[PDB]
Design a protein around this nucleic acid. Structure first.
Lengths: 258, 123, 164
RNA sequence: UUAGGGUUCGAUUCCGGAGAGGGAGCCUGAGAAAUAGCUACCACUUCUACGGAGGGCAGCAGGCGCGCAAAUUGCCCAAUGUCAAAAAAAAAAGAUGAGGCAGCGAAAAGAAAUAGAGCCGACAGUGCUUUUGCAUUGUCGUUUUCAAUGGGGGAUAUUUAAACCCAUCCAAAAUCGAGUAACAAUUGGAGGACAAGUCUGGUGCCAGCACCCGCGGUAAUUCCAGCUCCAAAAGCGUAUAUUAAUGC
RNA sequence: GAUCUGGUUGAUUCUGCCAGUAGUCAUAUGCUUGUUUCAAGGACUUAGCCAUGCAUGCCUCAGAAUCACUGCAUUGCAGGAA
């Protein structure tokens, strides 16, 4: 059982430094995996800057002033992965974490009624006792009584105001879809095709807007909406389009002349 | 003599932190013609007039970084709302520069030695 | 343990140090530009060899290669800065025509003298280190500070200076 | 370390495995065949009014031994993490030789002081020249002279958990200080390889030098001294291993 | 920097090693140092033996207080040992 983590062996999507400190926090197990998560203390301290020190993050959280999933937390360490709404009511602000283009955690700011919306990808379906069907998700949530049309790897729109599931969205056909992991993170596009290799990983080919096709694993597909004009949730800072190295450098210079 | 030295204090990026009820403001200093480093007393006075605080008690500042060549300094400071909020929320050392800190705990070593001997006793 | 700070050498001694050819072309510099010791002449040599390595490697490549495109503009850009080459240069063969003096020439020690603020290079090295020079408004007391093409026209003197 | 191909190293900060004097066995626990948990044997080892009872530093310091060879029985939980019933504070601030800080530290690595300038005299080179003379550049020198600054001293202070280091300053009314700038650079070389002596004294196949080639038998460019000059420079020699040199 | 310099001979051209040569967070060692910035540091020779001290304990608003424990209170409250 591991209870310690070193800064280098920790993700640098948390944007820790080589120098200053030796350890990084190992979060308590929860909805999300160690690599894909970002621990509370990291967010509050290094990004939002409502804390300058570890101890100050305990001060805020133990007390309680912070909610995720609309539930208040007294937890110092807790995962925050993907499609999680966090709300600090003291500020009155609602963040929705996502994957920004270029592999960065996005923190995107939402209207208040969008922060009751959430999207969870389904992993398995199975029948449990009493013939009661269950969809188990990638956040470990159990949706009792899902629709009879549910399949593995589809999204379920999930009301956090009161817990239930309205209409689903499938991974079928061309639909607006975004990537999770694999270093095509936050890049958005239509499904062009879904290749099958049975007994092995199923490739899928995505085509983003303004062309430039590419390939990513089925496992890394996470649906957004029916269409780009039917999206239920906001996009991060960049729209889900990447640009060439040359153009990055060019634009960096142009703005620096101001 | 040929001049009067003055201490100029400014600020750059400001926060309102309602969670801890404090302000977080990156200070700048300039201090043209001032001899040596600027004592923190002056800075507290300038900041008082600037943010319309009636106290240098609520103003508590830590760290100052003197850039190479000439009189220059930059730093960071904290204003709090109430004086009760200050005492409670803030670290011991920061407070004790104002003289609002707590008395130091007895030496670490003597604690250890005694804390061991307490494991032996039954009452 | 647990140190994650790098160390690197910036200077190295050329092979066969008793070549009377090399000795000539050392003293010629170190006396003229007022350099402290040979270590300085070598320090610039290294950084120049480095630059010239990547430029050679880029030049090899066919046109419209990403390495060529991106990193070509960068090498050129930073020789426009510091005034090593002018803005009529683009080839990455110009970059390979750089030699040791053109570096030394743009060090603060020489730039001070050449702009008319000292009477010798030796004398301008003192003017630096007695904290009585600036490079726009920032007091620099290092003679090996390489001066931008823009900022060699704003040198002035320190505001701590009895000469200013 | 190498242009390339390669060559060689990995005890050691991160990840993985294994171990806690040598072996084996076991309990508890979700997880252990745990060793600052237990049981036994063996090699050691500490107390005892000798009836008995203990010990395991390859945890941090420290001691002995070992070898060519390696730091303080220091300060702190402020930071970074962890453990917990646990936010802080309220009379009222949990623990941590994990970890941070300082001491010691020419392994290694970055920056940089030991001077700079005007007059006079001497020397060399170039141009013009009536050969008298003039101009320019560089060097050296006197009881020559002029400014400026750090090393160092101190603080209205500041850094830090506390205190230092760095930095900023010598009044803002009020605060130090170089002229042989004694605040004085050394370690190896000058026959060849290999940058630098047509030197002077001493020694005379002795003493010694010499990686190698070779020097020394009274005429030493190499030894032992002095002066002179050279290379690198706050670093420079020597030993061993390894890589380049090697298409050996 | 894709580097061949001395040594076999009366003199010469080869083969061929030896010696010279530059690096090493690679260790030891001699001599010498006025400051700053950054650091490895009992691995190598015995995973040899160890004096002494210290190195994981922990409770709020919320599991158990009649310390014959302390204050405020006067058959009521708050701290609070182990």
């Amino acid at each position: 059982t591991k209870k310690h983590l070193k800064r280098l062996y920790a993700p640098k999507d948390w944007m820790l430094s080589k120098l200053t400190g030796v350890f990084a926090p190992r979060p308590r197990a929860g909805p999300h995996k160690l690599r894909e998560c970002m621990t509370l203390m990291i967010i509050i301290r290094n990004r939002l800057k409502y804390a300058l020190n570890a101890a100050e993050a305990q001060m805020i959280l133990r007390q309680g002033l912070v909610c995720v999933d609309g539930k208040p937390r007294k937890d110092t360490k807790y995962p925050v992965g993907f499609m999680d709404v966090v709300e600090i009511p003291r500020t009155g602000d609602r963040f929705r974490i996502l994957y920004d283009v270029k592999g960065r955690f996005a923190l995107v700011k939402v209207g208040e009624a969008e922060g009751n919306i959430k999207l969870l990808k389904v992993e398995n379906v199975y029948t449990s006792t009493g013939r009661i069907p269950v969809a188990m998700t990638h956040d470990g949530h159990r949706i009792r009584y899902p629709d009879p049309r549910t399949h593995r790897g589809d999204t379920l729109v999930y009301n956090l105001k009161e817990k239930k599931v309205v209409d689903l969205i499938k991974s079928s056909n061309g639909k607006v879809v975004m990537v999770t992991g694999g270093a095509n993170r936050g890049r958005i596009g239509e499904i062009m095709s879904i290749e099958r290799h049975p007994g092995a990983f199923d490739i899928a080919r995505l085509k983003d807007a303004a062309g430039h096709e590419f390939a990513t694993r089925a496992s890394n597909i996470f649906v957004i909406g029916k269409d780009m004009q039917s999206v239920p949730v906001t996009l991060p800072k960049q729209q889900g389009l990447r640009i060439n190295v040359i153009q990055e450098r060019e634009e960096k210079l142009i703005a620096a002349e101001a | 003599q040929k001049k009067k030295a003055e201490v100029t204090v400014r600020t750059s990026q400001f926060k309102v932190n309602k969670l801890l009820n404090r302000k977080q403001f990156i200070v700048e200093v300039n201090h043209p013609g001032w001899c040596g480093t600027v004592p923190a007393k002056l800075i507290r006075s300038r900041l008082a007039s600037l943010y319309k605080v009636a106290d240098e008690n609520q103003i508590s500042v830590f760290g100052f970084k003197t850039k190479f060549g000439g009189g220059k300094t930059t730093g960071f400071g904290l204003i709090y709302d109430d004086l009760a909020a200050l005492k409670r929320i803030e670290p011991n050392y920061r407070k004790a520069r104002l003289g609002m800190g707590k008395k130091k705990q007895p030496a670490r070593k003597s604690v250890k030695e005694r804390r061991n001997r307490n494991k032996k006793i039954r009452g | 343990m647990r140190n994650y700070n790098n160390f690197n050498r910036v200077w190295k001694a050329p092979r066969r140090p008793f070549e009377k050819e090399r000795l000539d072309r050392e003293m010629k510099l170190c006396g003229q530009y007022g350099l402290r010791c040979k270590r300085e002449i070598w320090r610039v040599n290294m950084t120049l060899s480095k630059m010239r390595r990547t430029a050679r490697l880029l030049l090899t490549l066919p046109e419209n290669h990403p390495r060529r495109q991106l990193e070509g503009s960068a090498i050129m850009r930073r020789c426009h800065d510091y005034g090593f080459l002018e803005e009529e240069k683009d080839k990455l063969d110009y970059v390979l025509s750089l030699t040791v003096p053109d570096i030394l020439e743009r060090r603060l020690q020489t730039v001070v003298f050449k702009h008319g603020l000292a009477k010798s290079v030796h004398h301008a090295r003192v003017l630096i280190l007695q904290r009585h020079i600036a490079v726009a408004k920032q007091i620099v007391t290092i003679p090996s500070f390489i001066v931008r093409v823009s900022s060699e026209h704003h040198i002035a003197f320190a505001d701590a200076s009895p000469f200013g």
